[PDB]
Design a protein around this ligand. Structure first.
Ligand SMILES: Nc1ncnc2c1ncn2[C@@H]1O[C@H](COP(=O)(O)OP(=O)(O)OP(=O)(O)O)[C@@H](O)[C@H]1O
Ligand SMILES: Nc1ncnc2c1ncn2[C@@H]1O[C@H](COP(=O)(O)OP(=O)(O)OP(=O)(O)O)[C@@H](O)[C@H]1O
Ligand SMILES: [Mg+2]
Ligand SMILES: [Mg+2]
Lengths: 55, 470, 478, 240, 354, 240
């Protein structure tokens, strides 16, 4: 009985830690995604204008 | 000499040629009024704003309405001044467009009325107030957890069904009732259906007589959608400066102002900036925001709804907008569903005014204690859902007991809700709010039922409501 | 020599530049020497930029071009009902002339703020998910958005078919599609009988770009004729993205400055002009209305693209369709969580409003608990009632092609679901239960159906319960 | 080529098969000459007239009352990006579509058809039959469910799945392998002769796999075979 | 006669083009008819490109432009102490004119390799965290970097206030801030008595982009006046990111091809030229020093962005202020992991270091 | 500077050390100038002639029969983007590269050299020796295997790893820390004096770590020491 209680407590703690780590990873990944999106839009608009005023 | 002639038309962009030595200045307003000379022409009534001097006595302008039917060579009249709109008592209770013409069917303003230019420099350094002052709104949650600043800018966040319009109407009513200040609503990029609904709601509520409304509708050109905010600001500045009042200015969505700026820049052919925005993004935002300040004789405070593109707070438009904000109010659909009708999120909303230097030590301590209690209650939600209330410890039960009462006491009965509920509204001073929340935190009312805190004003009304129930 | 004539300087890519034409207006029609029409869009210092509304292979430098003195306009009238036509009003079905005696300009001002009225009348699409969770009212602008092959056209076709017994005139505008696809759509409408009140406007992929640019304006101009007469009109634009691409092509060929994704600066102004002409008029000028259903096709689900953001900003509500939902078996594939309608309950009858709130609460609770479905296998806790209710709700919201449901039947089935009468039916039998329930209703619940149709409110609760139990004791679980 | 085919469609009423090696090169050549012709660039460097040029060609390739042309076109997707303007514009001109993924090609599955992205107007109950429609929809549902399980499998392992999810994975792997086939023209690549499978046979085989008649067979026996009996023969040769 | 007088040809977005001005120098001041100043930027074959240093609404085609004969300059002197001025040196506090008698060029060469000395004198900010973990020496260039609402202005104001009993002239340069915030900062300085040794240079968010461009250089020239006289000066640039944005706006209006994040190619040179003028002079040069504390505002704490990396590669260390640490109640939220002073320790007093 | 060095290389036959403080600034200044010269901008706003100018500078820095020039050049990477054109084009001109990483620098590892990205032509068995080559390759193999697990450790830690992967992590962390060193120059930042480690000692120490000799020592004892004996000494000095 003591071992079963210990096992359930251990699972609860481990899954809590895993959830917190996943949330932090999601936050950092979203930041990187937004940076990449902005950089893309900048690159296409600059290429468009360079081609346009090259004429 | 003030006569020019159209030489180029390319969509909303018009080029006009003037006589040498008589060019109009930048931001001047030009008028085209033409009567159909024959069957192959149409009537024209159009306004243009000067943008650039191209040389060779030609001016590039942006149109305030549709350019269909224009012909090269027709006469253009220079007014000698920027766009000018009526100001004063005459604007209260009326609906205007960007040009200052009444959009409602109540009749037009007489030509002898005073009109002020839309474009002007910001107030000078020595004309500004030297000390920060709190603006008391009479709303408990706003006054406690996110105080407003006279002359400050407040960002408003929320969805559609969360009561933004009701909050705006209550702010207008309370400010007019207790401080004697008018309000101005600036509908930048307003949908026509929603504008009609808002006009009818304000007329029903009765706050229409204390407010002036300016609508720049979505189907209007980018120049008009860009200048609507400035014409509303000009309307408010008269009451700040001449009457010495404290005035509220509402901007329907400032992101649409930035987007209209981007569209105008693209039309004029300037090189795009970082994410496709105009090069002058920060300069335009500053020229708008720096005129909303507190002076030695009055102030203008602004509530601004903000749209965040792709939920990216790092995006240049929100990043530039947040550089001017002093407070933030968040509306929560979860609270709206729970029945907290002010619906202001108590933990997400923030304010730079919540500091003991300006708000007071007792106020600061009470606010921090309230926020801490609500954060702990927020944490306990999962364990309450899993194991139930009975499995919690005694101090957790005490925390829940205090927190539910605090959450209910953050609600309030609004004056503008009387037409629906039958209950009169309340105006609660910040001192009463602080004292009531301190008493709740001290456990002076642990024995009262939680429903007694639902929709009341001062703390004594909780006792009266509990006594009335039993 | 005269100011009413000109000569061509340059021809190519479907646009021409002409010298002269001093008195031409912006947006005027012009006529070339061989009889092809054009539209004047660029008035420059010494030349006029003309977009050509026909085959430009017959035009050469030096050809004469003449004024017409008229702004673009289209025929309007009741003789367009049942016909398929191009944006210029010329029939393409080969059924003869159109016989129209009136015209209306392509560009027109939208109704003002004081000319309108609050939306208060339901537009019944016949789709349970839309009618319950994202209502559409008459005079509303609702956007249908999603990736390719998600069901956008099917939604519109079902909505048009459902308007048979309602005082509604439908207009379907096809932009940039295959002529064969348009032919198939017209054949389905004819088979289901919708051509008795439907006008079809087509601008296929082979047509010149200005026709694709002008098609939705022609559709809305034809609709406004009925709207200002006191009638109710429904207009569907099938590719606003393709219309925007055509306008971008024209703008780039006229050498106007580009913006994000090479679109011109007034691409938002274009769509706002188009979509602000849908309105619900006030009683002072007839209760006429025009409701619009624009379509936008996303690429890989990116709703943050420039045109999708513009249209989402403009419209009053959005309906999102998703391919993962489509392949999961969710048949209309509508994401009810993301979709929103700002008109809300104002576009619903009382009987639907009294059950829609419970339906939405159950669906949201299920979506919040979807991750617990695997752990309910050993019956860990008593929240599994919510999971069962959500599964049955998802089964109920499914629907087949070209089979719209009457609003009274939708109300009754949603009432049965939300009152717990399906709690003992296995989730595999819910569709057959609904079908047999509709048949049983047609056989015996005519009084309930008539009561709902006449009073727009729920029947007596006891009578509904008795009827449901009577059917339930005859249903056989598979 | 198109005018050569149009002669036979119109003047003789013949049925015509038209194969186009790669229709993307037409658009690519247009974009190569656009700048020298003097036109401003469009979004991804393409010509402004991309859609119009594509439509003026594609709308000619069609069946009429006088005759029918059935056409199969190969369309290149630059950098595997299906949102690229050329394939995105091409999508609207087709009745049936086959999507090839190097994600499947890298795994050894050929012809590497994406089973979800591929669409056809002929997949309706009244055209192919109710049994065919139900089998196809069930296969797509199983594969879609399997796609979602991979993300959590890669993290938490297979042991944490429920018994229903384990069965879903077990059958989805076999279905995905059975969608492979050995082609006649691919002997130089596979080392074995190709096979021809009738539609009735493939429907019956997939129905049996869905019902679970072959759960005990090893999943490698389903690769590049043809009919369902060949799976049994391959597994018998493997010693099962 | 078009030698000393010109005529405006084009005006728009704060830049102008003039015909004439045959003898104008590159970088010279010119004066428009209505009194607004400008700077001659490009000397083309037939026209002069002029950047307008003020409101350009009143400038029209056909207006007269005349030479001033002076390279771009600002007034300097002790009379500027205690005043609030714009980047051109014009007072904005309403206390009357400024009685300076001499000027300095706004663009000046930095001290050479042999004109400098190692930093060896402490600059006491009065903040325990900084003075302990990240010491600052006189003549050092230390970056202060962090997100908005993190306390950079508070750190700068405390540092300026602490210099009361120390031989130190302080210059506070505000670029792109709110006029109300500048007013409140000036009021706090007045209350604490720092105006006896402080100069304030302001260019608010409503001002045209060229003034935001020029403000840091005016500040550094005013500081250099004292530095070359043997004194010690502290200069604070409240945002260099706002200045970078203003320069990007000007470059895009001049149609120069943009690069990473639409910034021009010389965005690094813009800041390096400015920050290289802070130095510790040698005994031969007189022993004066100028200390710079530039500010950079990051987005979501991203230190890897273009402008932050450019500034980091110039200064002698950085102090990173952390937003979530700030919210947790640690208002001087120093992130000790990222903060570093490269030329510190040598300036720290013996009692403090051990 | 190169002109001054070439004289000593040629006219006197000397061996020359050439240190260049930052060669990226050369191309950056070229890009600043190129806009005003009237040239059309290249991909990221750089000059169109970026490669030729860099080649003309770098090709002069070489060893000849008359004399030898060995050059050590620091190269700035803008915004930590290694795909930037200026850092990208200079890779082909180098015989040996060391790549520094902010991620390693923040974890306290100095000189923060990336052990997998850094390469050299001299790493070959016939140049450095057979055992040197074997030790280097095995170290790189363990570090690659450790890198492949970082997502799993990031999400759920080391508890669900297999026994082999646990030993891989155990060895790899100690190897990564032992790659750090205390520099003579860094004695101004911290009081710890620097060390000079011969290559024989380096090879022996890493071989001993790979063989599992020091698995019982704490991983913090491998930081900034120098020779392998110092690891034992500081582990003894702390608690062990
Ligand atoms: N509710 C439904 N039940 C069954 N099949 C459906 C349903 N809705 C759509 N489909 C089918 O799914 C496919 C989607 O076609 P549809 O024209 O409706 O999509 P679309 O999003 O408009 O795509 P397109 O990009 O091809 O225009 C068709 O084969 C259609 O028959
Ligand atoms: N040490 C401190 N103790 C208490 N409050 C502090 C401290 N430092 C700063 N604050 C307060 O925290 C807030 C930070 O604002 P501050 O202007 O100092 O930051 P900032 O980064 O310069 O802001 P911004 O970019 O918005 O101008 C202010 O309200 C300030 O009064
Ligand atoms: Mg479709
Ligand atoms: Mg600050």
């Amino acid at each position: 009985l003591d071992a079963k209680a210990s096992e359930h407590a251990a699972r609860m703690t481990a899954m809590k830690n895993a959830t917190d780590n996943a949330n932090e990873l999601i936050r950092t990944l979203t930041l990187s995604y937004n940076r990449a999106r902005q950089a893309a839009i900048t690159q296409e608009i600059t290429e468009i204008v360079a081609g346009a005023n090259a004429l | 000499m003030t006569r020019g002639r159209v030489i180029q038309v390319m969509g909303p962009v018009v080029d006009v040629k003037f006589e040498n030595g008589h060019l109009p200045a930048i931001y001047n307003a030009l008028k085209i009024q033409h009567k159909a000379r024959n069957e192959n022409e149409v009537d024209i009534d159009l306004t243009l704003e000067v943008a650039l001097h191209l040389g060779d006595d030609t001016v590039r302008t942006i149109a305030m309405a549709s350019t269909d039917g224009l012909i090269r060579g027709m006469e253009v009249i220079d007014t000698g001044a920027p766009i000018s709109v009526p100001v004063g008592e005459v604007t209260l209770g009326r609906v205007f467009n960007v040009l200052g013409e009444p959009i409602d069917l109540e009749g037009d303003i007489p030509a002898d009325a005073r009109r002020d230019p839309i474009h002007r420099p910001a107030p000078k350094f020595e004309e500004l107030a030297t000390e920060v002052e709190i603006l008391e709104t009479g709303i408990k949650v706003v006054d406690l957890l996110a105080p407003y600043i006279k002359g400050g800018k407040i960002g408003l966040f929320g969805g559609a069904g969360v009561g933004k319009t009701v909050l705006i109407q209550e702010l207008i009513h309370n400010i007019a009732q207790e401080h004697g200040g008018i309000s101005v609503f600036a509908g930048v990029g307003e949908r026509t259906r929603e504008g009609n609904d808002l006009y009818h709601e304000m007329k029903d509520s009765g706050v229409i007589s204390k407010t002036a409304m300016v609508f720049g509708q979505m189907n209007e050109p980018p120049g008009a959608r860009m200048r609507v905010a400035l014409t509303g600001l000009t309307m408010a500045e008269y009451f700040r400066d001449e009457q010495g009042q404290d005035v509220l200015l509402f901007i329907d969505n400032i992101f649409r102002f930035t987007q209209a700026g981007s569209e105008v820049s693209a039309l004029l052919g300037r090189m795009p900036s970082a994410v496709g925005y105009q090069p002058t993004l920060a300069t335009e935002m500053g020229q708008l925001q720096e005129r909303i300040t507190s002076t030695a004789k009055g102030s203008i405070t602004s509530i601004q709804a903000i749209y965040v593109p792709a939920d990216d707070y790092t995006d240049p438009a929100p990043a530039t907008t947040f550089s001017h904000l002093d407070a933030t109010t968040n509306l929560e659909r979860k609270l709206a569903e729970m029945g907290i009708y002010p619906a202001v999120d108590p933990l997400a909303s923030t304010s730079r005014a919540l500091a003991p230097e300006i708000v007071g030590e007792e106020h600061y301590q009470v606010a921090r204690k309230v926020q801490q209690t609500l954060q702990r209650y927020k944490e306990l939600q999962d364990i309450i859902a899993i194991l139930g209330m009975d499995e919690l410890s005694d101090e957790d039960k005490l925390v829940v007991h205090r927190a539910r009462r605090i959450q209910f006491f953050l609600s309030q009965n609004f004056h503008v809700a009387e037409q629906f509920t039958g209950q009169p509204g309340s105006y609660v001073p910040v001192k009463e709010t602080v004292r009531g929340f301190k008493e709740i935190l001290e456990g002076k009312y642990d024995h009262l039922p939680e429903d007694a805190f639902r929709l009341v004003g001062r703390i004594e009304e909780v006792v009266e409501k509990a006594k009335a129930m039993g | 020599q005269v100011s009413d004539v000109g000569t061509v300087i340059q021809v190519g890519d479907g646009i021409a530049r002409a010298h002269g034409l001093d008195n031409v207006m912006s947006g005027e029609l012009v006529e070339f020497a061989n009889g092809v029409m054009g539209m004047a869009l660029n008035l420059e210092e010494n030349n006029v930029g003309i977009v050509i509304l026909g085959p430009y292979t017959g035009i050469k430098e030096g050809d004469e071009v003449r004024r017409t003195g008229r702004i673009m306009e289209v025929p309007v009238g009741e003789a367009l009902i049942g016909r398929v036509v191009n944006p210029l009003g010329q029939p393409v079905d080969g059924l003869g002339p159109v016989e129209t005696t009136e015209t209306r300009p392509i560009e027109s001002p939208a109704p003002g703020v004081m000319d309108r009225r609050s939306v208060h009348e339901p537009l019944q699409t016949g789709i349970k998910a839309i009618d319950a969770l994202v209502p559409i009212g008459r005079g509303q602008r609702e956007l249908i958005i999603g990736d390719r092959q998600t069901g956008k056209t099917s939604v519109a076709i079902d909505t048009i078919i459902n308007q048979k017994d309602q005082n509604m005139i439908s207009i379907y505008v096809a932009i940039g599609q295959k002529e064969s696809t348009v032919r198939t759509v017209v054949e389905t409408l004819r088979k289901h009988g919708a051509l008795d009140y439907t006008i079809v406007v087509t601008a296929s992929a082979s047509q010149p770009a200005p026709l694709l640019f002008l098609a939705p304006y022609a559709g809305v101009a034809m609709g406004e004729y009925f709207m200002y007469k006191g009638k109710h009109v429904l207009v569907v634009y099938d590719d606003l993205s393709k219309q925007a691409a055509a306008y971008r092509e024209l703008s780039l060929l006229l050498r106007r400055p580009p913006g994000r994704e090479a679109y011109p600066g007034d691409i938002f102004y274009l769509h706002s002009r188009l979509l602000e002409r849908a309105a619900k008029l006030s009683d002072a000028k007839g209760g006429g209305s025009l409701t619009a259903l624009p379509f936008v096709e996303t690429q890989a689900g990116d709703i943050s693209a420039y045109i999708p953001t513009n249209v989402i900003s403009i419209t009053d509500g959005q309906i999102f369709l998703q391919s993962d939902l489509f392949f999961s078996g969710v048949r209309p594939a509508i994401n009810a969580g993301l979709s929103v309608s700002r008109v809300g309950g104002a576009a619903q009858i009382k009987a639907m409003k009294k059950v829609a709130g419970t339906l939405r609460l159950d669906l949201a609770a299920y979506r919040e608990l979807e991750a617990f479905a695997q752990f309910g296998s050993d019956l860990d806790k008593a929240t599994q009632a919510k999971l069962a209710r959500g599964a049955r709700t998802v089964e109920v919201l499914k629907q087949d092609l070209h089979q719209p449901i009457p609003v009274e039947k939708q109300v009754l089935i949603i009432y049965a679901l939300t009152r717990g009468f399906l709690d003992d039916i296995p989730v595999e039998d819910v569709r057959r239960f609904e079908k047999e329930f509709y048949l049983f209703l047609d056989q015996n619940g005519q009084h309930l159906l008539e009561h709902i149709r006449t009073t727009k409110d729920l029947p007596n609760e006891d009578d509904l319960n008795k009827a449901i139990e009577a059917f339930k004791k005859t249903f056989v679980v598979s | 080529g198109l005018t050569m085919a149009e002669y036979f469609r119109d003047e003789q009423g013949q049925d015509v098969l038209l194969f186009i090696d790669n229709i993307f090169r037409f658009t690519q050549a247009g974009s190569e000459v656009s700048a020298l012709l003097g036109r401003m660039p469009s979004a991804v460097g393409y010509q402004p007239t991309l859609a119009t040029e594509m439509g003026q060609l594609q709308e000619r390739i069609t069946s009429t009352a006088k005759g029918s042309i059935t056409s199969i076109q190969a369309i290149y997707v630059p950098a595997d990006d299906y949102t690229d303007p050329a394939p995105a514009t091409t999508f609207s001109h087709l009745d049936a579509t086959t999507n090839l993924e190097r994600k499947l090609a890298e795994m050894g599955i050929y012809p590497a058809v994406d089973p979800l992205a591929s669409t056809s107007r002929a997949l309706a109950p009244e055209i192919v039959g109710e049994e065919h429609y139900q089998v196809a929809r069930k296969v797509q549902q199983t594969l879609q469910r399997y796609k979602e399980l991979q993300d959590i499998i890669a993290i938490l392992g297979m042991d944490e799945l429920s018994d229903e999810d384990k069965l879903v994975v077990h059958r989805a792997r076999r279905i995905q392998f059975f969608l492979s086939q050995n082609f006649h023209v691919a002997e130089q690549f596979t080392g074995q002769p190709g096979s021809y499978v009738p539609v009735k046979e493939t429907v019956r085989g997939f129905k049996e796999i869905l019902e679970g008649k072959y759960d005990h067979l090893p999943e490698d026996a389903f690769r590049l075979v043809g009919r369902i009996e060949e799976v049994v023969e391959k597994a018998k040769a493997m010693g099962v």
